[model samples]
Target: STKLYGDVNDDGKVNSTDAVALKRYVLRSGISINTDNADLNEDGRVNSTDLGILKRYILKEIDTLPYKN
Candidate 1:
């Protein structure tokens, strides 16, 4: 009934680990994450696109999770 947006690791916080987790998930080398939280672009597909946004957010280059293009 709720979403954490960028909380990929599902630790209740969005941080660099999220970017790393998303990367691992995309690369098929991670455990697992709620895909619902990883779709930063809300594009219905989880991949490098969302990962890019996560990285940007962690770097403070973006002020939001769903970068919206």
Candidate 2:
């Protein structure tokens, strides 16, 4: 399947699993994620900010992953 933006697990969907995996990655719990998709803001870092944006994507609070301001 094509890589979907925000699909941290790279399972082809942007769901809670991505958020969970991203959190683990951010928390340094030894979980690996698709950094390309996990970097929500694309600032070159995977952290709480990315997780926050990812959650918003999952919740549909935002309509897109590459959210432009």
Candidate 3:
């Protein structure tokens, strides 16, 4: 399943906390992510691009994740 787009934290909602969690995972700050949900771009990897997308979602700049799957 494609996991609720920006719901990285898997808390059933896309919010700032999810963005924060994604940042930590991207920064490798001892934090891990659910690759299934973390790949916001569906690019096969979790990185800054995914982080940016997640933030955009939180900011309501986008309606949904642009997963290229």
Candidate 4:
């Protein structure tokens, strides 16, 4: 299941606040992250590394979107 971020207005660039959103959902026990956007590296699992990857994309404006299946 995918956890939706509370911030949806895209208020300015992503930062520590986004980190909180990422951490809260990522750190949750037994919480399976949705692989759609969660799989940043396209490998598997949504953890700290994937968060970092997504964070970078949001901050750097990189095309973080993965191919749709």
Query: Which candidate ranks first by TM-score, i.e. highest?
Result: 2
Estimate the overall C-alpha local distance difference test score of candidate 2: 0.80
The models' CA-based lDDT, in order, is: 0.81, 0.80, 0.77, 0.51
Model 3 pairs in collision:
none
Tens digit per residue, CA lDDT, model 3, 3-55: 78777777777768888888898888887667668787888888898888878
TM-score of each: 0.84, 0.85, 0.82, 0.48
Of the candidates numbered 2 and 3, which has the greater TM-score value? 2
**Among these predicted structures, which one has the highest lDDT?**
1
User: Which ten residues in a row are the worst by lDDT in model 4?
Assistant: 1-10
As a TM-score, model 4 comes out at: 0.48
Estimate, for each residue in 1-69, the C-alpha lDDT of model 4 and write its tens digit. Answer: 233332212344434565555665677754333334455565656567767666666676556355222
Ranking by TM-score: 2, 1, 3, 4
Total clashes in model 1, counting residue pairs 3 or more apart in sequence or in different chains? 0
**Candidate 2: lDDT of 14?**
73
Mind giving the per-residue lDDT tens digits that candidate 1 earns over 1-69?
A: 357788987788887788877888889885688799998888998888888888888787888546675
**Poorly placed runs, candidate 4 (over 4 Å):** 1-20, 29-33, 61-69
